[PDB]
Design a protein around this ligand. Sequence first.
Ligand SMILES: Nc1ncnc2c1ncn2[C@@H]1O[C@H](COP(=O)(O)OP(=O)(O)O)[C@@H](O)[C@H]1O
Ligand code: BEF
Ligand SMILES: [Zn+2]
Ligand SMILES: [Zn+2]
Ligand SMILES: [Zn+2]
Ligand SMILES: [Zn+2]
Lengths: 111, 374, 151
Amino acid sequence: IKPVFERFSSVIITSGTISPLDMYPRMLNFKTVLQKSYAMTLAKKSFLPMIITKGSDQVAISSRFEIRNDPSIVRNYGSMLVEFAKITPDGMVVFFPSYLYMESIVSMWQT
Amino acid sequence: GGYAWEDEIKRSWDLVKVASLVASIVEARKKRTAKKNITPYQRGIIRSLILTLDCSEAMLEKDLRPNRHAMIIQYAIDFVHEFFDQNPISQMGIIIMRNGLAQLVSQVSGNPQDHIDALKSIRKQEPKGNPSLQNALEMARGLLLPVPAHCTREVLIVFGSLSTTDPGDIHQTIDSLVSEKIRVKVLGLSAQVAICKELCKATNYGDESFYKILLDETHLKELFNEAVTPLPVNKINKGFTLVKMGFPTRIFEDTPTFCSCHSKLVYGGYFCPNCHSKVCSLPTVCPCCDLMLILSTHLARSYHHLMPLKTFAEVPTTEKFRSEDCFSCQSRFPILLTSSRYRCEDCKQEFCVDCDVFIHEILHNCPGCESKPV
Amino acid sequence: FIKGATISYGKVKLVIKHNRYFVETTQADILQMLLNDSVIGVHSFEIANESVEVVKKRCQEIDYPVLEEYDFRNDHRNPDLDIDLKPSTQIRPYQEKSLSKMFGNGRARSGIIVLPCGAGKTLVGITAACTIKKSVIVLCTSSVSVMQWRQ
Ligand SMILES: Nc1ncnc2c1ncn2[C@@H]1O[C@H](COP(=O)(O)OP(=O)(O)O)[C@@H](O)[C@H]1O
Ligand code: BEF
Ligand SMILES: [Zn+2]
Ligand SMILES: [Zn+2]
Ligand SMILES: [Zn+2]
Ligand SMILES: [Zn+2]
């Protein structure tokens, strides 16, 4: 990317999810005249983020690859997926950390 | 890594430590603001409504005590009574989605007793299976075919599930409904659904206000009561026409005679003014010459919709008052901050809060306006 | 009635060294008055182990009652037992509240916890032992119940 910044005088680096803004100037050597993030002035809470750390049985859950074949973790994710599918009206997207992890979990869920 | 025990004691008692009339007025004014705008929108007095109820596994949920099935059925009975009291000429039909199929429980007719009885029987039936909007809509589409053209087709789906299992493409049914001029009102129970929103919007000429999801038990009754009133029609749609009808005369007879409607012995009845056939009750289509028999009172009940009484505006406190007592009920206005006087624009006569609600809900004519001599 | 007994909380303290009980206090004037009494027999003095109950009752008789507090965090000379509740285990609301009162100030204090039969006093005791992180000895009424405590 060195030729790009040396050639073009003005570059607009924009993205919906890009933070921290101070890393890219460090990781990619370039200087920024302006850099900021805009908060959304929304009348009501349009999105409800949540950080689930435990299952119903109050057992910690993590997707560490070395404990992927753990019945406790696998079941808690499985129950979580079902519960959100029951209350979700139309669409539900599930993102796994790696494809191999997705295969192992799905196979365990099928059994 | 100390636990919460070692930190401190909660000290619950520390949390507790030791204008209403104006609040009610401003709250009423805010509520009255929604009622300020009123215009005589043309509404179809004659209507045919197909009531679709969801009887599926989703009804077994205990969100609405005791269960969704019980509350929906119970409020349906009240809706049937209210619907036929405000609109006497209208006819209604009942459908239920159960076991993935739409099951007819009462033919489209104008007798409230038949629909009430059908709902009563459904009480014991245990909901099961998945709902099917397409099956209910296709059955509703067929039911609304024989209805006369002048009648405004209406469908009131009470949907409770979040997913629909259809045998075909439901989008085709939505297009078909628009072709037949059928308007669908959906009362969701849990959350918004993409197909339900599209069905209501497409069939209501793009209006998105006909799909409502309640938020508590109390709101359900308000949603049910709202559907009782007739819906306005769009300018582009044209259905102007005349309908032949007659007013029979009640006949008293010493000896009972056979009824043409049910072929049963009844002491009294109404003699048709065309074929002289006797009918047990009104208002129903004559069993012989198929002209809808009605009384003048049935038409009268719907007049207030055509010309609604204009909403009253609270008088400012600074301005003087016409009198110290209510014009109609003669109840002294409390001295109290803000004067609690409401005057009708046409006749300029103050009214109390009790009269304001009464004169716009039950009584549909301002007492002062009738008293004023022209 | 409330005023009289709400001021004697923390004048006299009792601590336990290696195997000798020292009834000491930070201040020096008050203990001198206590020592003058013939019944008992910064200042710290070793008291006979057998006669510990006698002084404890006597302190209750006198205006100042004896306090029983032990700062388990500070002292590490006594070997510490490494134990913690299992991840699956969860403390019930009332059990959490009952144990919170014992450790309200962050230091364990002796007392009696009364819960209805079946409430789970065994788990309350287990949690109390775990947090202190010291040697724990359990005395139980019957051998059958001793097996229950072990399990
Ligand atoms: N937090 C808990 N979750 C589940 N079971 C519990 C819990 N706490 C206590 N129990 C149960 O309570 C029962 C009685 O406990 P125990 O300590 O013997 O009661 P007691 O107060 O009579 O000594 C046991 O079966 C135990 O497993
Ligand atoms: F109070 Be328990 F039954 F030990
Ligand atoms: Zn009859
Ligand atoms: Zn006739
Ligand atoms: Zn009045
Ligand atoms: Zn008036």
